[PDB]
């Protein structure tokens, strides 16, 4: 994740132009290697045509250069790339939306599961840990960064996501599929036990806990789906052949011919095909957006920070269910205790953002006395 | 936010043409500086070509002017800008949709949390204040206007969003991440305490309160997500290079050459490239839509009024949970108490809007007696 | 709202061609004035060129006519108009989807709030009236037709939407923002009072009532949002300049020159630029779709019938909660009381629509005996 | 509804080519009449030009044929048709999604409403019948097929959807709007009565019943909305004029001129304008998709089978709430009662579909011993 | 399903280029037969023109070759294919999203339905089996792979999805429609019986069970809808005629003529029409994406693995409700029992993914002392 939200807060002079001076997550980082290969091939062909070929061979190469230059437009690269990248970006944001957060669940576990004694602490910690464990099991199944951090269940044990007892239980339950679903069943059974043991006072609170946990389950299932059901390989191959064929053709059709023949469109021989390179930049960068985003759980600069999310979820969830359980700030009358229309102040830097309320678009309509009178 | 909803209520003669006479939130305000730089560069190049260059240098410049003018169309600016701005507008409206409003929560807190005594008042005020505090913590994390208004937690204390006790508690809980989630945990624990203390009469009402509060939490999480997960920097750089390369090329390809040579398409030498300027207006304004909307929590004219929303939420929520708690208008028989078919009157200005009911599209189908008869 | 659903039920010969003979909500009604101005300007320019200008001035005008005619295509009107109108149509249908209907709420109020005495009647009527009042307050804030019908809160009192007591209470609560939210708080507190007074038998029914009411609140909030957050004025100005610049250019580039010069594409001098007029019809009508739909609560022919919806909601909701409360048709054995497979008859006009059930796409797959046998 | 799902299960050789040999729901059925009119007009113009016109008149007709042929491309038919048909297809699938099914409701009514006696049977049948009656009232309001089957409420009585008592009650309640909402109010009041009479044991079950019923109400409201709020007539007229103007122009611009003059692009005189006819097929068929789908409740081949859905809903719902109420198959130990890893067999035809489980995309990542070691 | 998620984790050099070396689910596999037919026809026409035709016949064929070559662009294949394939891909992902998973339901059944005795085991197994049976009945109705595995209800009995008693009960209930809905009614009635028998302790838990089961019902209904309501056959025929007409025209317009005549664009006679073949690859592969995805439950390589999902659902659901019922790992203090800020370790391979928390986009805004001061 490369965040530049602060740099584009306002539409200032050359707002997006300042972003062209970024390297991490940059288009340069993504397609400099492909561009170097393309440039090498282009100039190898240029030197072959300019030095090796004979007069008749050079004429036959020139005829093919103008034949290829007329079909470079026959390729509908823009359409294919436009639909495919839109599909990849949609899937990318859905995959983010299906990253599980324990915040709703941890608030309900902190509130509903009672007891300041060791048993209450252990019960709350175990429930939240089940939620975190389910999340990490799916994430290590779908995220290469998380897998590299936890290449085995024993690593999850050493890192504190799973106890040795939980590891043994998981081994006992092993089926020939992903076992990421197990902690949800454990959670449901432990919540039932807590309710029967009086730690959850009412079954409506148990229903709320199970609802939040099942929401997390659905998110983890969606992550499994996106990891398993790739964008059809045929659609990916179609877009790839469009881009590569376009630039393979450009490798010949965009050669600078001998100006002597004075072919139409070859009057002046510049050495660098600047607009060909700009088209490469545009089309290959647009494809590289898909190439980076198609699996957003990899290790690209703009891929999701799954490891950070795992660490932050564990810390936050344990703190909320253990230290913050029935641990509230003192409840005292606030600053506006007897102020009917509170008006919090503005700093000198923010005074310009004070606004009158928008009352609705009809507020300033003017009508005559006769217009406003009800009719029988 | 520049509201013009009232001006476009009806499709009147030149409805959208009257909007070209607006300055605030206008396209002129957004790209006058870039346009001035472009115009300066265009005329500097014009004077260089017309005065400095020699006959042969002028001919070589003219050859490049017609070479560049033929590739200005090779750029697929329309496609790149069309997909990117659609993505930015989608994200912009989602970000609005994820601005938290306490209205549902404050109705449930006003109704469910009982007691006209000081303790009931304090409990209701504290719960609603927790909701407002969570909202303001995330908003100051994502909105430059709100941050400038509350550059520190001490400012939140001085403005009445947070008590000194709440500030101390937040400091005690500090982790190396955003603490905007804390007030939700506080809310859940305080609602549990209110239920156990008899201020909430049934656990179904507590479930309702926690559901509304968790909805606000999810909205605040979405705001955090949009602030953190920028549109991929590669996609932004691709669109930026498309626009800038197009107009850099136009800076040469759209020069007015000497009419003497009588080049095709250069017959008449106008001094102002009116259609080039219109293309600049169109493409750069379309890009400036993205530049303004990509971070809708900045300080642009059309950015969201986060400060107003904060103030209005605090005022409304405190009034609803404190002054309006069990404070109802007298319940008396209405104007249509014994009128089976109430028909509220129309003013002379509104009589034209009285309509017969639409009964469905099948209402006027005509069938014969034999057509309408059931068959055995 | 111009409904033509019945005319397009079937794909008949020239189904959409018969719709070109409609005036109300027609494209003619929307852009006849603009077209008359355009036609007047076009022929004024034609007469100026044909009569006033000298030979050399006419030649200079002709050179500019063919210069302008070559850039009329440089304008990407189709793209700009295509994205903007799609955004406007999406917002238009969302705004419809957020029009509040009391039907769910009124069924729950009719069922749950008990008592055939005057107090039960008054309680049910007051709750449904709160829902209607919230709806009308937001609608008069966002709809010019509703505002013209209720230009003041006193008009709401005279029309029976609000009692004098409710009006006084609203004045007492006045804040410098829209007060459309107040009736929801009133509803929540009155429902709580009804539950505590035994008129609502269980708190689960109170939860259901509050859920439906909060759904209506969310819809009203969405209406407020769409009224307040206009489509960015920059995007509207961009599309407007695209259309107007295109046709300003056409005003010169589409002039019929003197055939004598025999310019390419000016061989025959027709007096009416039929295809220019068709382009005007197309592009300006496509823009007029946005101009009419951008604020669907105005007074255009195809704008929503907010007044009708208000009247119909009041009538229906009062009837459901008052006259239909525990007022059921006699419950008796039906026509198929002992008929295992009911087959309601068809008329002679409908016999053709009787179909066999679709059993699924796999139903007709044929397999051999050996193919169908399970393997160990 | 023309189902071809079975024919396109696999991407076989010429999968979509075999579908060109279908008549029902075919493009031929939809635009053969328009095509015959177009062909007649084209050849009438051909014979007029070839026989009636004089040499000078023929030359003036030829000049107009090449003038019209150059603007046939000026029409942006593809854009207009592409956005409009996408809107129509979106609305078409939403309208399907809002067809009410009693399956959720009938399961809850079968389970929750108790009693094997005549009163329990009558209560369950009456509740499900209310749901079916609401559905049929809206469907006969919006569907021409259903209206033709039930052209009056008396037909609903004769067909068993409504009892004479229900008909009398509906007449007593008559307001000047669609009364499709009434059965929901009846349902809510009858469910309340059943709860108070002990036939529904807990108010949570009553909440579930009312939730499902209100979901059906919302679907029926959406159907009413789509029937009432047509796609703006202006947008429909714009697309219609685009298509018709294009082909009116083609009627002249696509005439085969005399080869003698040897005009560019008229070298060889074929009698049939094959590509003009293919363009007619394409554009008019794309428009006919909208013409058929714009009202999917008509009587086109691909319109929804509303009558079948009505019949199937009545049969299924009555069977589920009456015959299947507490009528369960014997509960006995299953085939895998003591088999920890059940493996249901495969037939010889399905053995090829047995797969190993996908374990996640990270499963095959290989790391060294040192890479896998945790760091302090 | 061909998963390549692991290969595209990172945007590496030629990431998508390595995918062109895949056969299963490849574009080659999908359109090699059509391409062979096209190539055969192209070269048959080439040999006919080059050998059979006389001088005048060859000239007439050449005139038609350049006439056809000018209309190959008149076809708007890109637009038609672009909208249709987007619709097919949307439907494809919705169909995946509506594949039922028992995970939520099985967690609730494992937790809520009590008893370690044989009766509790049998009740839990029977409920989960009802859910699985409903899923398999719909899947065998819509999936050719599942139908081939279970070509009769007797096969479902032999495979253990249905008992002989359940089969007899289904036969007794037979109506002339799909009976996939029956197991939901059975589930609701059996859950009611379990609640009345004390196996479900509270009706809120029964409400939760029925909610999850009804969610599965809605998913199965959506699957039935997508199987029944095909994409309109007219839209499919339109796209098919676009592609086939384009390439039929190319069969003549893309012939290599005799270079002797030196026609424009036919200067050099290459034997293989490389760009025609690339266009075939592009357009026909883009169509083959739709052809494979239009019914994603077939037996294509990229079709869903319905059989695997069926097997995995049965195994997982039975294990969760039977072996894991109240079978929890020992609850013991975790690794961070008294560690306020848990920091799970990183491996040497993952150390690079450790990040500082993102605190929000406003975090680094700098303001002066005077700027930060509140104003009165
Ligand atoms: C192409 C871009 C070049 C840059 C623009 C040229 C400079 C335009 C004049 C300076 C801006 C107006 C002054 C201002 O600061 O204005 C504030 C005021 C309130 O803003 P409001 O009217 O939105 O409310 O606005 C008003 O005086 C009333 C609004 C009048 C604005 C009309 C501008 C249309 C023509 C510009 C293109 C030439
Ligand atoms: C290109 C734009 C130029 C402006 C239009 C030219 C003026 C057209 C005639 C004046 C409008 C009709 C008069 C009217 O006020 O009409 C009301 C009436 C009810 O409206 P309704 O029919 O929608 O129901 O309509 C009717 O008389 C029946 C409907 C007949 C309208 C047919 C117009 C098609 C041709 C126009 C283009 C030339
Ligand atoms: C370009 C448009 C001009 C109008 C069309 C020309 C007239 C085509 C023949 C008349 C229609 C078929 C007769 C019919 O009423 O058919 C019913 C039958 C059932 O319908 P079903 O096969 O969908 O099941 O269909 C069948 O006989 C089997 C289906 C055979 C239809 C093949 C038509 C493809 C070629 C047409 C273009 C030339
Ligand atoms: Ca990646
Ligand atoms: Ca901004
Ligand atoms: Ca309007
Ligand atoms: Ca239809
Ligand atoms: Ca398939």
DSSP for residue B83: H
Any ligand 2 atom below 6 A from CB of C21: yes
Tokens 């108490």 correspond to B337
| Tokens (6 digits) for E302 | 């990229």
Give the SS3 label for residue B105: helix
Which one, of B237, B256, B276, lies nearest residue B72 by Cα? B276
Say how far apart CA E42 and CA B189 lie, in whole Å: 77
Return the number of other C-beta atoms located less than 10 Å from residue C266's C-beta: 19
Helices (H) and strands (E) in chain C, counts: 14, 2
Say how far apart CA A43 and CA A47 lie, in whole Å: 6
Chain B to chain E Cβ contacts (< 8 Å): 45
Chain D interface residues facing chain B, Cβ-Cβ under 8 Å? 140-144, 146-148, 151-152, 155, 158-159, 175-178, 224, 227-228, 295, 297
SS (H, E, C) chain E: CCCCHHHHCCCCCCCCCHHHHCCCCCHHHHHHHHHHHHHHHHHHHHHHHHHHCCHHHHHHHHHHHHHHCCCCCCCCHHHHHHHHHHHHHHHHHHHHHCCCCCHHHHHHHHHHCCCCCHHHHHHHHHHHHHHHHHHHHHHHHHCHHHHHHCCCHHHHHHCCCCCHHHHHHHHHCCCCCCCCCHHHHHHHHHHHHHHHCCCCCCHHHHHHHHHHHHHHHHHHHHHHHHHHCCCCHHHHHHHHHHHHHHHHHHHHHCCCCCHHHCCCCCCCCCCCCHHHHHHHHHHHHHHHHHHHHCCCCCCCCCCCCHHHHHHHHHHHHHHHHHHCCCCCCCCCCCCCCCCCCCCCCEECCCHHHCCCCCCCCCCCCCCCHHHHCEEC
Say how far apart CA A343 and CA B62 lie, in whole Å: 65
Residue E230 — φ and ψ, nearest 5°?
-65, 160
DSSP for residue C7: G
Which one, of A371, C89, A249, lies nearest residue B347 by Cα? A371
| Tokens (6 digits) for B21 | 């006479």
Say how far apart CA D29 and CA D17 lie, in whole Å: 17
b/e sequence E13-46, b meaning 16+ C-beta within 10 Å: eebbeebbebeebbbebbbeebbeebeeebeebe
Say how far apart CA C270 and CA C263 lie, in whole Å: 14
Any ligand 2 atom below 6 A from CB of C24: yes
Say how far apart CA C350 and CA B374 lie, in whole Å: 9
- Closest ligand 1 atom, residue B22 Cα: 23
Torsion, Cα C136 C142 C144 C148, to 10 degrees, reads 40
Say how far apart CA B304 and CA B295 lie, in whole Å: 10
- Closest ligand 3 atom, residue D24 Cα: 23
Say how far apart CA B103 and CA C67 lie, in whole Å: 60
Question: Chain B partners of D202 at a C-beta cutoff of 8 Å?
Answer: none
User: Using CA positions, which residue lies closest to atom 3 of ligand 2?
Assistant: C32
Tokens 């072919």 correspond to A263
Long-range contacts of C267-276 (CB under 8 A, 24+ apart): C267/D63, C267/D67, C268/D60, C268/D63, C268/D64, C268/D67, C270/D67, C273/C42, C275/D71, C275/D74, C275/D249, C276/C42, C276/C250
| Tokens (6 digits) for D292 | 């058929």
SS (H, E, C) chain A: CCCCHHHHCCCCCCCCCHHHHCCCCCHHHHHHHHHHHHHHHHHHHHHHHHHHCCHHHHHHHHHHHHHHCCCCCCCCHHHHHHHHHHHHHHHHHHHHHCCCCCHHHHHHHHHHCCCCCHHHHHHHHHHHHHHHHHHHHHHHHHCHHHHHHCCCHHHHHHCCCCCHHHHHHHHHCCCCCCCCCHHHHHHHHHHHHHHHCCCCCCHHHHHHHHHHHHHHHHHHHHHHHHHHCCCCHHHHHHHHHHHHHHHHHHHHHCCCCCHHHCCCCCCCCCCCCHHHHHHHHHHHHHHHHHHHHCCCCCCCCCCCCHHHHHHHHHHHHHHHHHHCCCCCCCCCCCCCCCCCCCCCCEECCCHHHCCCCCCCCCCCCCCCHHHHCEEC
| A169 labeled part of a ligand binding site | no
Give the SS3 label for residue C347: strand
Any ligand 2 atom below 6 A from CB of C23: yes
- Do residue E178 and residue C359 have CB atoms under 8 angstroms apart? yes
Say how far apart CA E30 and CA E14 lie, in whole Å: 23
Query: Residue B159, Cα to own-chain centre: how many angstroms?
Result: 26
User: Using CA positions, which residue lies closest to atom 27 of ligand 1?
Assistant: B23
| CB-side neighbour CA atoms (13 Å) of E361 | 28
Yes or no: say if A35 and A284 are a contact pair by the CB < 8 Å rule: yes
Yes or no: say if E307 and E149 are a contact pair by the CB < 8 Å rule: yes
User: What does each C-alpha distance from D174 to B103, D37, D143, D177, E207 come to in angstroms?
Assistant: 37, 48, 22, 8, 37
Tell me which chain C residue has its CA closest to the CA of residue D177: C312
| Tokens (6 digits) for C292 | 């009419």
Say how far apart CA D238 and CA D246 lie, in whole Å: 12
Say how far apart CA C161 and CA B106 lie, in whole Å: 24
Question: Chain C partners of A372 at a C-beta cutoff of 8 Å?
Answer: 151-152, 155
Selecting from E6, E9, E362 the residue whose C-beta is nearest the C-beta of A299 gives E9
Tokens 């626009």 correspond to B243
Q: Which residues, in sequence order, are CB contacts of A127 under 8 Å at separation 6+?
A: A109, A113, A187, A190, A191, A194, A209, A321
SS (H, E, C) chain D: CCCCHHHHCCCCCCCCCHHHHCCCCCHHHHHHHHHHHHHHHHHHHHHHHHHHCCHHHHHHHHHHHHHHCCCCCCCCHHHHHHHHHHHHHHHHHHHHHCCCCCHHHHHHHHHHCCCCCHHHHHHHHHHHHHHHHHHHHHHHHHCHHHHHHCCCHHHHHHCCCCCHHHHHHHHHCCCCCCCCCHHHHHHHHHHHHHHHCCCCCCHHHHHHHHHHHHHHHHHHHHHHHHHHCCCCHHHHHHHHHHHHHHHHHHHHHCCCCCHHHCCCCCCCCCCCCHHHHHHHHHHHHHHHHHHHHCCCCCCCCCCCCHHHHHHHHHHHHHHHHHHCCCCCCCCCCCCCCCCCCCCCCEECCCHHHCCCCCCCCCCCCCCCHHHHCEEC
| Tokens (6 digits) for C251 | 């005003």
DSSP for residue C374: E
Yes or no: say if E88 and E235 are a contact pair by the CB < 8 Å rule: no
Question: Chain B partners of A312 at a C-beta cutoff of 8 Å?
Answer: 177
Say how far apart CA D309 and CA D311 lie, in whole Å: 6
| CB-side neighbour CA atoms (13 Å) of C335 | 20
Selecting from B168, B184, B306 the residue whose C-beta is nearest the C-beta of A103 gives B184
- Closest ligand 2 atom, residue C23 Cα: 23
Segments making up each domain of chain C, as ranges: 100-228+319-323
Any ligand 3 atom below 6 A from CB of D22: yes
Which one, of B154, B129, B150, B128, lies nearest residue B141 by Cα? B150
Q: Which residues, in sequence order, are bridge partners of residue B346?
A: A375
| Tokens (6 digits) for E300 | 């294509």
Say how far apart CA C163 and CA C157 lie, in whole Å: 6
| CB-side neighbour CA atoms (13 Å) of E230 | 26
Dihedral sign from CA coordinates of E208, E214, E220, E223: negative
Yes or no: say if C371 and D15 are a contact pair by the CB < 8 Å rule: no
- Do residue C362 and residue E146 have CB atoms under 8 angstroms apart? yes
Yes or no: say if D265 and D111 are a contact pair by the CB < 8 Å rule: no
User: Using CA positions, which residue lies closest to atom 11 of ligand 1?
Assistant: B23
Strands A346-347 and E374-375 come out as antiparallel
Return the number of other C-beta atoms located less than 10 Å from residue A54's C-beta: 9
Query: Residue E283, Cα to own-chain centre: how many angstroms?
Result: 21
Say how far apart CA E366 and CA B148 lie, in whole Å: 9
Say how far apart CA B266 and CA B246 lie, in whole Å: 20
Yes or no: say if C206 and C197 are a contact pair by the CB < 8 Å rule: no
Yes or no: say if B33 and A13 are a contact pair by the CB < 8 Å rule: yes
User: What does each C-alpha distance from A279 to B72, B85, C322 come to in angstroms?
Assistant: 11, 20, 71
Return the number of other C-beta atoms located less than 10 Å from residue B348's C-beta: 15
Tokens 């390809």 correspond to B253
Return the number of other C-beta atoms located less than 10 Å from residue B355's C-beta: 13
Say how far apart CA D144 and CA D130 lie, in whole Å: 22
Which one, of E250, B268, B15, D258, lies nearest residue C293 by Cα? B15
User: What does each C-alpha distance from D228 to C1, C143, C316, E272 come to in angstroms?
Assistant: 8, 19, 18, 58
Q: Is B193 exposed, middle or buried (0-12, 13-18, 19+ CB in 10 A)?
A: middle
Give the SS3 label for residue B2: coil
C104 CA: distance to closest CA in chain D (Å): 6
Yes or no: say if E134 and E216 are a contact pair by the CB < 8 Å rule: yes
Tell me which chain B residue has its CA closest to the CA of residue D159: B374
Tokens 């994205």 correspond to C83
E strands along chain C, which residues?
346-347, 374-375
SS (H, E, C) C128-182: HHHHHHHHHHHHHHHCHHHHHHCCCHHHHHHCCCCCHHHHHHHHHCCCCCCCCCH
Strands D374-375 and D346-347 come out as unpaired
Yes or no: say if B194 and B186 are a contact pair by the CB < 8 Å rule: no
Compute, in angstroms, the gap from residue B296 CA to the centroid of ligand 5: 4
Compute, in angstroms, the gap from residue C294 CA to the centroid of ligand 6: 6
Yes or no: say if D38 and D269 are a contact pair by the CB < 8 Å rule: no
Torsion, Cα D159 D165 D166 D171, to 10 degrees, reads 110
Compute, in angstroms, the gap from residue C355 CA to the centroid of ligand 8: 27
Yes or no: say if E108 and E212 are a contact pair by the CB < 8 Å rule: yes
b/e sequence B39-75, b meaning 16+ C-beta within 10 Å: eeebeebeeebeeeeeeeebeebbebbbbbbebbebb
| CB-side neighbour CA atoms (13 Å) of E10 | 10
- Do residue D331 and residue E235 have CB atoms under 8 angstroms apart? no
- Do residue B5 and residue C295 have CB atoms under 8 angstroms apart? yes
Phi-psi region of B256 (alpha: psi -120 to 50; beta: other; left: phi over 0): beta
Question: Chain E partners of A213 at a C-beta cutoff of 8 Å?
Answer: 107
| Tokens (6 digits) for C367 | 């397999």
Q: At what angle do helices B103-112 and C182-196 cross, to 10 degrees?
A: 30
| Tokens (6 digits) for D349 | 């035809």
- Do residue C3 and residue B376 have CB atoms under 8 angstroms apart? no
Query: H or E stretch including B166?
Result: helix B164-172
| CB-side neighbour CA atoms (13 Å) of A237 | 27
Greatest distance between any 2 Cα atoms in chain B = 99
Which one, of A18, B13, A204, lies nearest residue C29 by Cα? B13
| CB-side neighbour CA atoms (13 Å) of B320 | 31
- Do residue C316 and residue D175 have CB atoms under 8 angstroms apart? yes
Which one, of A141, A147, A187, A146, lies nearest residue A166 by Cα? A187
Chains that touch B (3 or more CB pairs under 8 A): A, C, D, E
Compute, in angstroms, the gap from residue A10 CA to the centroid of ligand 5: 4
Say how far apart CA C154 and CA C167 lie, in whole Å: 8
Chain C to chain D Cβ contacts (< 8 Å): 297
Yes or no: say if B289 and C238 are a contact pair by the CB < 8 Å rule: yes
- Do residue D285 and residue E225 have CB atoms under 8 angstroms apart? no
Q: Which of B176, B223, B298 to mutate to test the interface with E (most CBs of E within 10 A)?
A: B176
Chains that touch D (3 or more CB pairs under 8 A): A, B, C, E
- Do residue D141 and residue B360 have CB atoms under 8 angstroms apart? yes
């Amino acid at each position: 994740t490369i965040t530049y939200t602060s740099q584009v807060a306002n539409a200032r002079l050359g707002s997006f132009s300042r972003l062209l001076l970024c390297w991490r997550g940059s288009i340069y980082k993504l397609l400099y290697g492909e561009f170097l290969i393309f440039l090498l091939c282009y100039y190898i062909i240029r030197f072959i045509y300019r030095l090796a070929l004979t007069e008749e061979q050079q004429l036959m190469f020139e005829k093919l250069t103008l034949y290829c230059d007329s079909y470079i437009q026959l390729i509908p690269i823009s359409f294919v790339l436009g639909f495919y990248v839109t599909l990849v970006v949609t899937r990318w944001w859905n995959q983010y939306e299906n990253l599980p957060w324990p915040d709703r669940l941890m608030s309900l576990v902190s509130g509903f599961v009672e007891g300041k004694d060791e048993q209450g602490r252990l019960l709350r910690r175990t429930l939240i840990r089940y939620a975190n464990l389910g999340n990490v099991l799916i994430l290590r199944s779908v995220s290469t960064a998380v897998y590299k951090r936890f290449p085995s269940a024993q690593h999850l044990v050493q890192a504190g996501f799973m106890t040795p007892a939980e590891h043994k239980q998981l081994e006992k339950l092993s089926l020939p599929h992903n076992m990421f679903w197990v902690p949800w069943v454990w959670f449901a059974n432990l919540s039932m036990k807590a309710w029967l043991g009086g730690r959850i006072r009412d079954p409506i609170l148990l229903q709320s806990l199970l609802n939040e946990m099942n929401t997390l389950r659905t998110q983890c299932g969606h992550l499994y789906a996106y990891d398993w059901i790739s964008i059809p390989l045929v659609y990916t191959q179609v877009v790839t052949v469009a881009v590569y064929s376009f630039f393979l053709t450009c490798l010949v059709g965009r050669q600078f011919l001998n100006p002597a023949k004075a072919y139409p469109g070859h009057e002046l021989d510049l050495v660098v095909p600047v607009f060909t390179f700009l088209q490469f930049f545009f089309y290959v960068g647009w494809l590289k957006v898909a190439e980076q985003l198609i699996n957003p759980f990899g290790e690209d600069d703009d891929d999701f920070e799954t490891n950070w999310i795992v660490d932050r979820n564990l810390q936050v969830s344990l703190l909320a269910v253990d230290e913050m359980h029935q641990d509230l700030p003192r409840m005292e009358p606030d600053m506006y205790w007897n102020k009917p229309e509170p008006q919090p102040p503005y700093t000198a830097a923010s005074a310009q953002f004070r606004r009158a309320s928008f009352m609705g678009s009809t507020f300033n309509i003017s009508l005559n006395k006769e217009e406003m009178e009800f009719q029988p």
